[PDB]
Design a protein around this ligand. Structure first.
Ligand SMILES: Nc1nc2c([nH]c(=O)n2[C@H]2C[C@H](O)[C@@H](COP(=O)(O)OP(=O)(O)OP(=O)(O)O)O2)c(=O)[nH]1
Ligand SMILES: [Mg+2]
Ligand SMILES: [Mg+2]
Length: 314
DNA sequence: GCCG
DNA sequence: CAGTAC
DNA sequence: CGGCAGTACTG
């Protein structure tokens, strides 16, 4: 858990990421993970090369940081990167939009606010800019889960509500709250976004909607914004997903993450003639859905030993 | 960027 | 669809 | 050479 190479490599990874070089940024992210969980400090080029996730090129960069104290490429990062990061930290704006605003001459959030064309989602990101960069204490994520759960349960007592994401992975702070709802009755989950969201609105808890297709009877997710009542409260991102019970174990696995963990698990299923999504684990193609009543069944069918959510925190 |  | 998001 | 996870809204 100790390295001084990763500090330098993260700056590069983030730069490629905000410039839209998503594959290169992915190679970096994994290299960093490998470096992060190596016992020893890495000392030989030979030793770097030996690691999975670390190729010829990553090894040369490591040998440079060791040999000298620096990575020369860090001196040549595009001058646009800090601005592109500023702009892609607006919820609903990504690298393409950031790059366009840059090309148009914008350089600050004041330029965005006064001159840029914003989508509805972006106007909401912008207005909650600081809040959405903050992580909340896990105790607050608890209160948010409980607000959602009380609202759901009032409608139907048998509804099951579990906070997922970082919260379920045991983290002390959380970027937002992700709540998964199902019903062991196989049926009653259907159509409730109507009732649940209307309830949470009546209380004034939800302050804005980001993604909510409420014209569709088969809406899967709500992504939006909430604020607990009373003084000293900030706006928080809230994600709610409602899933049939047969999909509960796959939904829980998915929504718990981490994102890297899921990508890795899916890559791996794929090497075994299988396919893993938030809905199911299947044979590959028309494939067959396999029965997965618990997360442990997903692990077992992939030939892997179970991992507690706290150990998925890649 | 990494890997098969 | 492209972009963005989980 | 070429995948790199698989899927859900928006406009
Ligand atoms: N953010 C993100 N989440 C993903 C992706 N793919 C994916 O399956 N997920 C799942 C795994 C995440 O743990 C889950 C919830 O997303 P999230 O952004 O709220 O993630 P989180 O709770 O783990 O982290 P955080 O909010 O505390 O920052 O959605 C992805 O590419 N990005
Ligand atoms: Mg953004
Ligand atoms: Mg989260």
């Amino acid at each position: 858990h100790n390295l001084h190479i990763t500090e330098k490599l993260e700056v590069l990874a983030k730069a490629y990421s905000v410039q839209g070089d998503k594959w290169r940024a992915l190679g970096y992210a994994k290299a960093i993970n490998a470096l992060k969980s190596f016992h020893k400090p890495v000392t030989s080029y030979q030793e770097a090369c030996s690691i999975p996730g670390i190729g010829k090129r990553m090894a040369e960069k490591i040998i440079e940081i060791l040999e000298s104290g620096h990575l020369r490429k860090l001196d040549h990062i595009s001058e646009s990167v800090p601005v592109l990061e500023l702009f892609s930290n607006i919820w609903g704006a990504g690298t393409k939009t950031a790059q366009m605003w840059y090309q148009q001459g914008f350089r600050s959030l004041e330029d965005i606010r006064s001159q840029a064309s914003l989508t509805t989602q972006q106007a909401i990101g912008l207005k909650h800019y600081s809040d959405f960069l903050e992580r909340m204490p896990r105790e607050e994520a608890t209160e948010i889960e409980q607000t959602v759960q009380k609202a759901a349960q009032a409608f139907n007592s048998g509804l099951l509500c579990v906070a997922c994401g970082s919260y379920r992975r045991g983290k002390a702070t959380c970027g937002d709250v992700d709540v998964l709802i199902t019903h062991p009755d196989g049926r009653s989950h259907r159509g409730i976004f109507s009732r649940l969201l209307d309830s949470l609105r009546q209380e004034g808890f939800l302050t804005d909607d980001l993604v909510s297709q409420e014209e569709n009877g088969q809406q899967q997710k709500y992504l939006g914004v909430c604020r607990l009542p009373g003084p000293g409260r900030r706006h928080r991102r809230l994600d709610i997903i409602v899933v049939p019970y047969s999909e509960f174990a796959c939904a829980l696995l998915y929504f718990t993450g981490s994102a890297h963990f899921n990508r890795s698990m899916r890559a791996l299923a794929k090497t075994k003639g299988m396919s893993l999504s938030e809905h199911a684990l299947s044979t590959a193609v028309p494939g067959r859905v396999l029965p997965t009543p618990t997360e442990k069944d997903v692990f077992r069918l992939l030939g892997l030993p179970y991992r507690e959510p706290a150990e998925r925190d890649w």
